[PDB]
Structure 1
Amino acid sequence: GQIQISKHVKDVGLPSIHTPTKTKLQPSVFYDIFPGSKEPAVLTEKDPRLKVDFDSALFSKYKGNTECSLNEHIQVAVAHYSAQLATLDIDPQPIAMEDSVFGMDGLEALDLNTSAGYPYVTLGIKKKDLINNKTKDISKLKLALDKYGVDLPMITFLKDELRKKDKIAAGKTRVIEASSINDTILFRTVYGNLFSKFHLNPGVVTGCAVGCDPETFWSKIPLMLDGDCIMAFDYTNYDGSIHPIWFKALGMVLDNLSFNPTLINRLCNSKHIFKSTYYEVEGGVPSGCSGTSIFNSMINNIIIRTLVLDAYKHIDLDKLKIIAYGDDVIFSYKYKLDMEAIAKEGQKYGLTITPADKSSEFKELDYGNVTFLKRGFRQDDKYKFLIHPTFPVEEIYESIRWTKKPSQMQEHVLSLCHLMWHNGPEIYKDFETKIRSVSAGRALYIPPYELLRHEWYEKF
């Protein structure tokens, strides 16, 4: 996206916003027993590890929009995907505010711990002041919605997380844009029935994987994505590279389903505060707020359709099976397509597509080497039809080496075990032994391989 406006906060009647500058990340008890090189992302200009201007390296996410327009192919992609989603018969009416706050079927309750955004972050007001979870009373919230209204600036926080070592000195730390609670509630109100239907129906009709459980969903993917050709590739800066035309296209699908097609352009043309600067961006999807993962998935469905259409012009879209989780996508067609040919068609829209898993060349894929949500695919030993989701061993080793809270170590390690065992008993037994070499790991419950495997069979 492109920065259209940039102003000092004191010149437009706004205050400075103060965002956490120190990491909660700390070496854990397993730091010296597992290998790794990730460190907490730089969170401030004064970090001694920096070797670059911090504010410039963050604002490089925004480097212009390519000159392009709607075409017939994007248009047929819109009509095809729309007719597919109509199959679901989503209720276009808004949901009650009670359901937006405390949830309903397919819509998780609002997180009451994260920031409430502008203006509440400057007023000493948190979410639990607006919403009482004990009584389910939202009277304070309703007054704050009336008083402050909607379409408020997003606060851009810096994501406190582990990063590869080369991204530390280069000041390459991710930005998340926490929208106001006022606006998250508006988006849930308008689009809540769509969000619910997607979460409850991950697969090839929504074209979306949000709300899936990889443990059981992995077995279904080969059934859904039939056709001789399994395809996947990676995007460079997906969120930032999405031109305004893809929001018009998304607006058109929402309109075909009788949903508000306009609220969406507040994501496209967005307003922000970072520290002491107010700024506005045209293009790009704000990373980390209202319906982000679903809207990105829907947009990816449009892109993949139009890109295949641009590269090949006797295509049958009924046979182009797609599953997307935001920027991450896997798809199939009834016969072999050239992924390089399809990727090249992205350039004219301002999309940058490289081969999957940081590969050198665009090569053919099968389920033996394809990745989705960081995971590979491996047939079970006894039942070859059940597919293990395979989480990278390296990412588990780096994760275990750090904590944000030592008290919740039992939960942290158990989560890692549930990921790890899918890579096989040999790698899992090595994992267990290293954990039990220190006395803090001796104190934990570490599930045996056989109980994990038996528990998994029973989830199906």
Structure 2
Amino acid sequence: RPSGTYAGLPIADYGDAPPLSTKTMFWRTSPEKLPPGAWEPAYLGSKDERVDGPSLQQVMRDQLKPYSEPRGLLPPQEILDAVCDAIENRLENTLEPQKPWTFKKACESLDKNTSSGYPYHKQKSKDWTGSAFIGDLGDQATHANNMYEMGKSMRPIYTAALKDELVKPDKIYGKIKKRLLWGSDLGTMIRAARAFGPFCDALKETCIFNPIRVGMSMNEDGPFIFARHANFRYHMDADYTRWDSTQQRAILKRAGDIMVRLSPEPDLARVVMDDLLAPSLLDVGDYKIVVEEGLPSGCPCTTQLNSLAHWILTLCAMVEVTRVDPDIVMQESEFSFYGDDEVVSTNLELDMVKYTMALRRYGLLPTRADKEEGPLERRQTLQGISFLRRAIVGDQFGWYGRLDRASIDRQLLWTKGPNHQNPFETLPGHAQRPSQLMALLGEAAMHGEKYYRTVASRVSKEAAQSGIEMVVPRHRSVLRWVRFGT
């Protein structure tokens, strides 16, 4: 056995995980000195020549703390039942009944350029023929499919990791922070995909009529989604600190319950869900620790499981404060969820102080989207609310999501390439970067003439020192392309 405490959590066995990556995927696009207080790749550990800091492993201990924190309270049982049944019912009425996912289709759906997790820690492509897994992964997949078809429980193993992403300089040179990732094992992946693939697809095709926006296109779908939010009087942001680690399994189980009953094979899906939500085994390297609470984020369905819990919690707080039936608040409101990310629009007169408190009571840590210091605030125009890193703007033509210039400028300073030790290194000219460049041009168009021109230059210099030179379109032409599509 072991057991055994690590990072505040019970040790369940010895670890098998590779060492945490000590490298970043991001290369500077230009050799010149970086704009002051500009974002950089997150901390890379001891071998990181930018600052001396703790080991990556100590950074991860830090990320594990909240998972041993005392859970918040459950919402009132009567309210929780009402909102669950309402959500479920709305889903019965909107989801197109789907036919069961095959083994072939589950394997196909998986991202082939990411790790297989426990036990082989292979990249998924290495054992993939184009249509089936063979070799080692062939074994893991096949065994899992057998367990799935025979409704037999199998215990999932997650591999912990630290997200390589651009962060504010503070999180590098001030108090060092780096976000925790859970990596599902391939077995669990295929098992969850077969079970819940059909439900997730059903949900994804309902991305505009139902509040879970997973699978949406900001450009094509945003204007209709935002127009719906604008039918209602009051609008609010809410951001959440540490969403994943503050979740209650009890609530996750209710989200899971809804997912089961709406799956085309409920008896087989129940075994899968029970395993997913059973106390979780997480491989930190030296050990596999037990993480009883919070969200286990490794799998294909996770982002929708997470959004569904979010839907439940928002309604519970709303119902609790307003005292209107969950079904009726859903006719007086429009919601958008994507993991921790919410926009609530309503006609109900919601007490924003009592709303914040009711959420805080559930164990959540709400903050405003770009404002700081709560309670949460409501506004009487959608104009300026934020969702998915975009500002919601609205004009003569309609609503849209606009990426702020700080973000555009940022994507022009850094490019994605092979893993390497020094962030500041330049590679050669990225002729894999004409697709990205068009989108960015498009993103800048929405900021008007003067800004567009200034990124048009930056884009052209880069298109020169590259194997493909570009027709840089006129402002009005690209604006028209971005806003009006298709």
TM-score, with length taken from structure 1: 0.86
- Give 1:278's match in structure 2, choosing from 265, 282, 288: 288
For 1:13 and 1:59, how far apart are their aligned partners in 2? 18
1:141-290 to 2 correspondences below 5 Å = 141-147=137-143, 150-169=154-173, 170-205=175-210, 207-225=211-229, 226-257=231-262, 259=266, 260-261=269-270, 263-268=272-277, 269-290=279-300
Match in the other structure for 1:119: 119
Match in the other structure for 1:292: 302
* 1:244/1:283 contact within 8 Å kept: yes
Q: CA deviation at 1:432?
A: 1.1
Q: CA deviation at 1:93?
A: 5.2
What secondary structure, in the 3-state scheme, does the structure 1 residue paired with 2:386 have?
coil
What secondary structure, in the 3-state scheme, does the structure 2 residue paired with 1:428 have?
helix
- Give 1:347's match in structure 2, choosing from 360, 385, 401: 360
What secondary structure, in the 3-state scheme, does the structure 2 residue paired with 1:87 have?
helix
In the alignment, does 2:362 pair up with 1:338? no
Match in the other structure for 1:76: 82
Question: What count of residue pairs does the alignment treat as equivalent?
Answer: 440
What secondary structure, in the 3-state scheme, does the structure 1 residue paired with 2:465 have?
helix
Q: CA deviation at 1:420?
A: 2.3
Match in the other structure for 1:54: 59
For 1:417 and 1:27, how far apart are their aligned partners in 2? 19
Match in the other structure for 1:20: 21
Match in the other structure for 2:481: 455
| Stretch moving more, 245-254 or 24-33 | 24-33
What secondary structure, in the 3-state scheme, does the structure 2 residue paired with 1:275 have?
coil
Counterpart residue identity of residue 363, structure 1:
E
Unpaired segments of 5 or more residues in structure 1? Answer: 103-108
Counterpart residue identity of residue 300, structure 2:
S
Unpaired segments of 5 or more residues in structure 2? Answer: 1-6, 148-153, 418-426
Q: RMSD in angstroms over aligned alpha carbons? A: 2.7
Q: CA deviation at 1:281?
A: 0.7
User: Residue 67 and residue 298 in structure 1: after superposition, are their counterparts in 2 closer, same or farther (change >3 A)?
Assistant: closer
Match in the other structure for 2:3: none
* 1:158/1:173 contact within 8 Å kept: yes
For 1:311 and 1:182, how far apart are their aligned partners in 2? 43
* 1:43/1:158 contact within 8 Å kept: no
- 1:327-375 C-alpha deviation (Å, 9 max, x unpaired): 1111222233233321210122111112222334543322222111111
Match in the other structure for 2:150: none
What secondary structure, in the 3-state scheme, does the structure 2 residue paired with 1:172 have?
coil
Match in the other structure for 1:101: 107
Q: CA deviation at 1:168?
A: 1.4
In the alignment, does 2:377 pair up with 1:363? yes
For 2:270 and 2:61, how far apart are their aligned partners in 1? 34
- 1:84-126 C-alpha deviation (Å, 9 max, x unpaired): 0001344365301221222xxxxxx4221111111111xxx43
For 1:55 and 1:157, how far apart are their aligned partners in 2? 8
Q: CA deviation at 1:255?
A: 4.2
Match in the other structure for 1:105: none
For 1:242 and 1:341, how far apart are their aligned partners in 2? 20
* 1:159/1:173 contact within 8 Å kept: yes
What secondary structure, in the 3-state scheme, does the structure 2 residue paired with 1:25 have?
strand
User: Residue 153 and residue 186 in structure 1: after superposition, are their counterparts in 2 closer, same or farther (change >3 A)?
Assistant: same
For 1:77 and 1:343, how far apart are their aligned partners in 2? 18
What secondary structure, in the 3-state scheme, does the structure 2 residue paired with 1:429 have?
helix
What secondary structure, in the 3-state scheme, does the structure 2 residue paired with 1:324 have?
strand
**Percent identical residues:** 21
Match in the other structure for 1:403: 415
Match in the other structure for 2:338: 325
For 2:17 and 2:226, how far apart are their aligned partners in 1? 51
Match in the other structure for 2:423: none
User: Residue 56 and residue 182 in structure 1: after superposition, are their counterparts in 2 closer, same or farther (change >3 A)?
Assistant: closer
Q: CA deviation at 1:321?
A: 2.2
